[PDB]
From a paper:
The NiV RNA genome is encapsidated by the nucleoprotein (N), forming a long helical nucleocapsid assembly. This assembly not only safeguards the viral genome from degradation, but also serves as a template for productive transcription of mRNA and replication of the nascent viral RNA genome by the viral RNA dependent RNA polymerase (RdRp). Each N protein monomer is comprised of two main globular N-terminal and C-terminal Ncore (Nucleocapsid core) domains, with each domain flanked by the N-terminal arm (NT-arm, residues 1–31) and the C-terminal arm (CT-arm, residues 373–398) subdomains. The structure shows that the nucleic acid lies within the charged cleft of the N protein at the interface between the N-terminal Ncore and the C-terminal Ncore domains.
A spiral assembly of the full length NiV nucleocapsid protein, bound to E. coli cellular RNA, was purified from recombinant expression in E. coli, and its structure was determined by CryoEM single-particle 3D reconstruction. Reconstruction of the spiral assembly (65% of the particles) with a mask corresponding to a 13-subunit spiral turn and imposing local symmetry, resulted in a 3.5 Å resolution CryoEM map. The final model shows that 13 nucleocapsid monomers bind to the single-stranded RNA forming a left-handed spiral turn with outer and inner diameters of 204 and 56 Å, respectively. Assuming the NiV nucleocapsid forms a continuous spiral with the same symmetry, the pitch for NiV nucleocapsid is calculated to be 54 Å with 13.4 subunits per turn. The spiral assembly of the NiV nucleocapsid is primarily formed through lateral contacts over a calculated interface area of ~3000 Å2 between two adjacent protomers. The contact area includes a hydrophobic core comprising an aromatic residue (F11) from one protomer and a triad of aromatic residues (F267, F268, Y301) in the adjacent protomer. The NT and CT arms, which have been reported to play a role in the spiral assembly of nucleocapsid, occupy a hydrophobic groove in the C-terminal Ncore domain of the adjacent protomer. The RNA molecule is bound to the protein in the classical “3-base-in, 3-base-out” conformation, where the RNA chain twists about 180° every 3 nucleotides to place three consecutive nucleotides with the bases facing the protein, followed by 3 nucleotides with exposed bases. Within the RNA binding cleft, a series of basic (K178, R192, R193, R352) and polar (T181, Q319, S344) residues, with well-defined density, are within hydrogen-bonding distance from the RNA sugar-phosphate backbone. At the interface between the two protomers, aromatic residues Y258 and Y354, one from each adjacent protomer, are positioned in close proximity to the RNA chain, facilitating the twist in its conformation.
Author numbering:
A (entry chain C): 4 to 397
B (entry chain D), C (entry chain E): 4 to 398
Write the structure that this text describes.
RNA sequence: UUUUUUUUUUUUUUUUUUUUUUUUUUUUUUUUUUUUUUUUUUUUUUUUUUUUUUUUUUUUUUUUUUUUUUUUUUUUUU
């Protein structure tokens, strides 16, 4: 009867998603140069970090080389970052040319391995680096200029630096796609955390200007977000040995997961699992069947599922609350009454049903925390006790 | 209808945890020197402990020296201190170099077997130890300076001494990463117990100056907390008799467990297992579902679970009460009302949701301990007795 | 919901607590000499006991000597005292070397089987036993000096003597680690019995000065308490005929069991098995779950459980009433109101929770002398008569 | 056998939150003690065959009455 319809909803949501796309769909690659350190000499690693910071500080650089810089800038972690790149790159938009900087002989720019083939590229980079200084009005990437000056001999001091700047990139990714500005509040809150717990050395704190230039690069290159989410899934995998370096990335991950999918998970939290009497309304049944199909769909996607928005994967559309707007309007009605932080999520969408939102508000507030409507009999609480709870709840 | 939601919560929590993370993630190892007692000689072991105390007392020693000094200083228990470190190291931050010191030939500075590579390491150690003495204005690590000169010749007094300095490190770890100041109250209260029980010899008590220099090394190095929690799990394990040495560590452990997860367990104690009538309120169902997922998650993590804050594991975030703030605010509302130990824990966090906290307080205070709502009927207590309890509780 | 939380409490309690600790944890042994009788000669055995009493009486003897002397002393019961020590010693703190002394010809010091190997040991012993005598203002260990004077040549008087002295050690162990001073009342009781019941010859009573020197040795050595509790568990096992000696010990052991865990058992004995109306309150639920977990934990620990304070096993901490203070404060409020022997136990802990203690009084006294309910309808007599009895009893 | 109708048209990105912070050894009591053989009754005994009455007898066909018989189209108003 209805079972056919429910199975048909399921059918639509999985239809044609099976199998493999034709190689005729293969997109034009773009060629990007990544200067990998490829050495354990701490001097070259820190100089390359400064070079890379400056590439992103520069308004005269192209996006193609800025992405390449972000690929050198994160990934200072491993003994062989060329393995990290080649194994986790996984992007058809990109062909990355990896250059070992080797001895890093050149003073402020990277040394070219084919020094002779073009001097103009070394000039281009030097112009970019000068532009980085001059356009930033002499202000270093760091809030203390001495951090720009000092060059590092000792591996403890190197990693203290590197992990602190990496962490400063990774705090960005959490909101770079989903609220590309206005997220300095959240990012400084997370910064406060990592320095309080002494994981990062705040001598290497980066200026809001540099962080914004990098956050913008992240908002507008998918290629670098793809690499970030690749490595973030990689280190999320359990039971491994962890160094402090990957641990802080993983930690950051917990802010990066479910990003840009607020609507979806908020209908599960403050719609489904809150389980007010309103879930018996006939109107919602289509929406409930939708969310069932979405949860199974989420499961079908597997490990990439919590990051779909950063990856800009198409399937997100299905996830959007336009697919279940009665239940979503209701759920936000609950969310905004229950959770003070849900008050501050923007719910200006065209498909807001204000009567169902007000029913959401009424289910939490007007029903007195739903206190009359105890969900389960395990407490075996007195009727009197429930009434007292409702009185205390105002 | 609802089952799919809870099973999806499960899914989210277990997603991508599976499998083993690629070697391409492997971090730059730093070099740590650990000086090790080669032999059961009391003269060696006590001088080396004094040296090691002085390395952490030093303003001029490098963190790479200091953490390896702290490793030797808390390996002094073992019949084979080199084996203890190398077997429980388990740290990709670190490459350890051991210097099994054969005969302590240099005297005040530690020896090195083939010499320092250009003599400079011995000179480095000497500078370290001088600067320790000079910066400390002559004052020893110990509260009685006679301990510093003592140059022990018998194993009985050595183990008395060692165990007492070790205990003094281990009293720190309980707060070193969770409130590294305000710690002195706890650390002295624990000190009181071990001396009252005559387990440690108070002749060897260490100065607040030295203890804070070591507490800071613990706060700022994960590599030493990794070693500590490795050995703390190791000795917590059953099915052997114990030497007083590992027993005292195990004893300390009971203060180190649950550290830095106050909020989590407090929601279990004073939200969940107290089973107030307030758990019928619809909103808390989301949070209850979360804590169920967290309990099963805790189980899934296994032996490291009680120490996840000291070992700085990402999963901790999951556990933070920001993840279930309605239940947490209510549970702290109960906790602070019921337990006169509570409320000395800081609950100034953004997600306090104080209507639910006040409902917590109004359960335990206003509902007279929730007096009416008896959970189980095996006593079948009279209404008059419940009223007497309401009177005596002072609401 | 709640079932998972209760299982989680259990999980926390048992998490780790399996497998084997790695031998990399293995503690430094301390090497100790135990002199033992080789043979069934009373002339040896009594003089060796006098020597051992004097070693413990000495101001100049080392702790390593003293513990070894306490081993010499308590092993006299058996036909193979070497076998008794070696087989029931179970301790990594220590490394026991046994000397089967042979004929005690070399004066007041014990015999050396291969002569003096340092050519100093006998002189060490001479100094020890001289300083024992001299430090004492000319006293003997015994209240009558003739006991010190009289050599023994028959087994019957030997065993009369030995048992009397061994008993005097064993009466101590019941409060050597808990309340190690103010023990004396419960060492003069405990000497009432035995003398009255004619199990000991009070000719061999020991002076308070010797008993406190031995009590101190017991408080401040774990290794001796470990040996005592090993043999105390050994003799507690049934299914065998016994000698007089072991019976006196076993009888003692009924004093030694549950020592130092007053608070734990008192929460079960008072409060919990009293099943007051107050136990139905929401407040206790955490604590009740705790006690349940502890009872099954007690079961899991098995034979050593009643002695975990004297063995100072880490787990003890778990048991401490800080782990369930609301239930405990109430339980002590019951216990002190009901039992005339309670209250003379010191309950000045920090986690006193006095509103619950006052409710513990107000149940067992204020609620009609603990007659505001009757727990179950075991016979179904009339309420009024029982209430009249409670009024006449006046709480 | 036959005789309708049967294209389409909306909506469908995102935006919050998320490290910590207290407690947490121990303390009391804990042998015993009284009673604890027996003692009386304890066969029997009365009464218990039978006896009266106990066929039958009245009445008991029938008889009156019992076809039918009148009435029975209409008419005002709107």
């Amino acid at each position: 009867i209805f079972e056919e319809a429910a199975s048909f909803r399921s059918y639509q949501s999985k239809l044609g998603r099976d199998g493999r796309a034709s190689a005729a769909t293969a997109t034009l690659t773009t060629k990007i140069r990544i200067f990998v350190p490829a050495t354990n000499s701490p001097e070259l690693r820190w100089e390359l970090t400064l070079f890379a910071l400056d590439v992103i500080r520069s308004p005269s650089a192209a996006e193609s080389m800025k992405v390449g810089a972000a690929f050198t800038l994160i990934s200072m972690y491993s003994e062989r970052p060329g393995a990290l790149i080649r194994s986790l790159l996984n992007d058809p938009d990109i062909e990355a040319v990896i250059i070992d900087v080797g001895s890093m002989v050149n003073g402020i720019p990277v040394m070219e391995r084919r020094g002779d083939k073009a001097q103009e590229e070394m000039e281009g980079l030097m112009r970019i680096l000068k532009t980085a200084r001059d356009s930033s009005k002499g202000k270093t990437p760091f809030v203390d200029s001495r951090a720009y000056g000092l060059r590092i001999t000792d591996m403890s001091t190197l990693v203290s630096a590197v992990i602190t700047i990496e962490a400063q990139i990774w705090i960005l990714i959490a909101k770079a796609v989903t609220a590309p500005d206005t997220a300095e509040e959240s990012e400084t809150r997370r910064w406060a955390k990592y320095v309080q717990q002494k994981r990062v050395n705040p001598f290497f704190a980066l200026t809001q200007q540099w962080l914004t230039e990098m956050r913008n690069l992240l908002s507008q290159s998918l290629s670098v977000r793809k690499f970030m989410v690749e490595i973030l899934i990689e280190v999320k995998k359990g039971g491994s040995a962890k160094g402090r370096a990957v641990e802080i990335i993983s930690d950051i991950g917990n802010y990066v997961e479910e990003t840009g999918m607020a609507g979806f998970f908020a209908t599960i939290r403050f719609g489904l699992e809150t389980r007010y009497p309103a879930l018996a309304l006939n109107e919602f049944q289509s929406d409930l069947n939708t969310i069932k199909s979405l949860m199974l769909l989420y499961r079908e996607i597997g490990p990439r599922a919590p990051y779909m928005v950063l990856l800009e994967e198409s399937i997100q559309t299905k996830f959007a609350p336009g697919g279940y707007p009665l239940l979503w309007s209701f759920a936000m009605g609950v969310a905004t009454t229950i959770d003070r932080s849900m008050g501050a999520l923007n719910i200006n969408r065209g498909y807001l049903e204000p009567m169902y939102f007000r029913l959401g508000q009424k289910s939490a507030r007007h029903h007195a925390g739903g206190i009359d409507q105890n969900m389960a009999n395990r407490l075996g609480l007195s009727s009197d006790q429930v009434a007292e709870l409702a009185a205390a709840v105002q």
